[PDB]
Amino acid sequence: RREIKIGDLVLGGLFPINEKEECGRINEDRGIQRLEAMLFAIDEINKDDYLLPGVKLGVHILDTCSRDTYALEQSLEFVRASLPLLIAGVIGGSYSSVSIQVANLLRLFQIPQISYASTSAKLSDKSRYDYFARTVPPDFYQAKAMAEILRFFNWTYVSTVASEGDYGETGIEAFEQEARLRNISIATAEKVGRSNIRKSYDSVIRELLQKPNARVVVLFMRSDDSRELIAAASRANASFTWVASDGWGAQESIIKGSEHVAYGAITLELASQPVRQFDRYFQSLNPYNNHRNPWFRDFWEQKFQCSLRVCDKHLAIDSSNYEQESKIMFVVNAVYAMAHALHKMQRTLCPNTTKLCDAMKILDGKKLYKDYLLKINFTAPDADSIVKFDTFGDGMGRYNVFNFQNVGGKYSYLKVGHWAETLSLDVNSIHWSRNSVPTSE
Numbered sequence: 001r002r003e004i005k006i007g008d009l010v011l012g013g014l015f016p017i018n019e020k021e022e023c024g025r026i027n028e029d030r031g032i033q034r035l036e037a038m039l040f041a042i043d044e045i046n047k048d049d050y051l052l053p054g055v056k057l058g059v060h061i062l063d064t065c066s067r068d069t070y071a072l073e074q075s076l077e078f079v080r081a082s083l084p085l086l087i088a089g090v091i092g093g094s095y096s097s098v099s100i101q102v103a104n105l106l107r108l109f110q111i112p113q114i115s116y117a118s119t120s121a122k123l124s125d126k127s128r129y130d131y132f133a134r135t136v137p138p139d140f141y142q143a144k145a146m147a148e149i150l151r152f153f154n155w156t157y158v159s160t161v162a163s164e165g166d167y168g169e170t171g172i173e174a175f176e177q178e179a180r181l182r183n184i185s186i187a188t189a190e191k192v193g194r195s196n197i198r199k200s201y202d203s204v205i206r207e208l209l210q211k212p213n214a215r216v217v218v219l220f221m222r223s224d225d226s227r228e229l230i231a232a233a234s235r236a237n238a239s240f241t242w243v244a245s246d247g248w249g250a251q252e253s254i255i256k257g258s259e260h261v262a263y264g265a266i267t268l269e270l271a272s273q274p275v276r277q278f279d280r281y282f283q284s285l286n287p288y289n290n291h292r293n294p295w296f297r298d299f300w301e302q303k304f305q306c307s308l309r310v311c312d313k314h315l316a317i318d319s320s321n322y323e324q325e326s327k328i329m330f331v332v333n334a335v336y337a338m339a340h341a342l343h344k345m346q347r348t349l350c351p352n353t354t355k356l357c358d359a360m361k362i363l364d365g366k367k368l369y370k371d372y373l374l375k376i377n378f379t380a381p382d383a384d385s386i387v388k389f390d391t392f393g394d395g396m397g398r399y400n401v402f403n404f405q406n407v408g409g410k411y412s413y414l415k416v417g418h419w420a421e422t423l424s425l426d427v428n429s430i431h432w433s434r435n436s437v438p439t440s441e
């Protein structure tokens with residue numbers, strides 16, 4: 001159990017820095033990189049003369065270990081005081097089950113919360129999650145997006161595999177409704193997960209195979225389940241055309257060591273433009289300059305398969321081993337959205353000072369969330385670039401459609417489409433099959 005404690009007002013941070021003894025493997029892109037996007041954002045605001053000057057932001061950043069129980073154990077730190085550092089708002093978590101588990105504790109103490117990745121439609125329930133907001137859309141849209149992809153290609157008989165829990169179940173139920181409207185019948189609907197209600201990944205692949213007419217299999221699954229289902233498929237000589245949600249997205253980790261069985265996959269992911277300034281930041285970090293991050297050496301030891309095999313002192317994060325994670329944009333926006341609301345509240349309460357006046361000493365969370373956090377700023381570095389929340393505190397339903405191919409020896413994810421309110425595709429760009437040399441024996 002490590003942490004990042006640094007400010008006049010402090011922000012809580014929650015990231016899945018670790019994965020599966022249920023913490024033991026670093027999450028390089030969705031963990032380490034995301035954490036550092038919050039650290040970059042806090043340094044940037046703390047230098048911004050126009051946004052929140054005279055009020056320096058500090059942090060309390062904690063690991064969720066990709067589990068809601070761990071996340072809740074961790075979140076007690078942000079509320080121990082109200083039972084030493086006084087947390088204004090919480091940035092995180094990533095995963096919907098975590099974000100839900102945290103929101104349950106944080107609403108009791110009136111702490112605003114902003115997720116940069118939790119897409120579960122369950123979180124749009126403002127009666128229940130009255131202190132939660134997110135820079136991402138609900139999966140009501142992603143399900144409609146995927147349904148529309150099937151409709152376009154006339155995928156009339158498909159199967160579904162979904163993760164149990166707060167992301168997959170809600171996810172696939174919307175898909176099921178969206179499919180029903182577009183005259184799409186589900187061949188087999190299976191569910192995967194830790195509980196004893198669920199079949200094995202090998203049993204699920206068998207249920208998909210025992211339905212030969214369904215070549216397309218829709219996935220509303222987490223990354224761990226996605227990696228496991230793909231492995232079970234490889235272990236069965238099963239070749240399906242996967243259409244997967246952001247849980248899989250454009251991630252190499254899911255497909256690593258099982259490239260052949262996933263070839264021709266169509267994965268979604270939220271529409272984002274890389275924050276170029278952050279590219280310079282991350283790349284500048286190394287295990288000798290970055291002391292503020294307690295997990296950074298474990299990350300560095302992992303990414304480079306060496307010890308601190310011994311690492312080379314001259315090693316660096318660069319274009320040869322790095323590409324900005326798809327949702328980094330959303331991490332920065334979540335930090336900035338929090339910072340803008342605090343600025344609005346201060347300009348009201350303390351108009352004759354930049355500083356945190358007597359009127360803003362005891363923070364009113366209910367006022368901070370409802371009267372302020374529902375703001376409008378142009379995303380910090382054309383028209384759909386403004387950070388805002390709907391009445392339910394959700395972000396905009398905008399997605400990029402990807403295709404898993406072999407460009408010429410190197411496996412990668414190519415953008416083949418987008419979803420705004422309607423769908424668009426570059427059909428000629430998509431590769432549905434592996435370019436495998438014929439066999440003559």
Ligand SMILES: *[C@@H]1O[C@H](CO)[C@@H](O[C@@H]2O[C@H](CO)[C@@H](O)[C@H](O)[C@H]2NC(C)=O)[C@H](O)[C@H]1NC(C)=O
Pocket residue numbers: 152153154
């Ligand atoms: C998807 O299906 C539609 C039909 O629902 C295809 O469009 C044509 O629709 C007219 C309707 O009067 C038919 O007469 C044509 O025969 C259809 N074309 C074909 C080739 O089936 C549409 O082309 C299909 N699109 C894809 C990409 O599969």
Ligand SMILES: *[C@@H]1O[C@H](CO)[C@@H](O[C@@H]2O[C@H](CO)[C@@H](O)[C@H](O)[C@H]2NC(C)=O)[C@H](O)[C@H]1NC(C)=O
Pocket residue numbers: 181182183
């Ligand atoms: C396929 O889905 C459509 C959804 O609208 C079903 O409804 C038809 O919609 C068109 C709209 O242009 C109408 O002209 C038809 O009269 C509708 N059909 C009926 C029976 O209401 C459509 O029925 C579905 N396909 C089939 C063959 O049932």
Ligand SMILES: COc1cccc(C(=O)N[C@H]2C[C@@](N)(C(=O)O)[C@@H]3[C@@H](C(=O)O)[C@@H]32)c1
Pocket residue numbers: 019030066067094095096097117118119120167221222223224246247327
């Ligand atoms: C590894 O353990 C878990 C546990 C729970 C979820 C997942 C998971 O992969 N969840 C996916 C879907 C997600 N949009 C969501 O959870 O709401 C965020 C997406 C992302 O962060 O980019 C994860 C993994």
Ligand SMILES: *[C@@H]1O[C@H](CO)[C@@H](O)[C@H](O)[C@H]1NC(C)=O
Pocket residue numbers: 349351352
């Ligand atoms: C700011 O200062 C002026 C004195 O010139 C005072 O009248 C005004 O009430 C002050 N505003 C607040 C909210 O303290």
Ligand SMILES: [Ca+2]
Pocket residue numbers: 045046047048049051052053054055056057
């Ligand atoms: Ca500042």
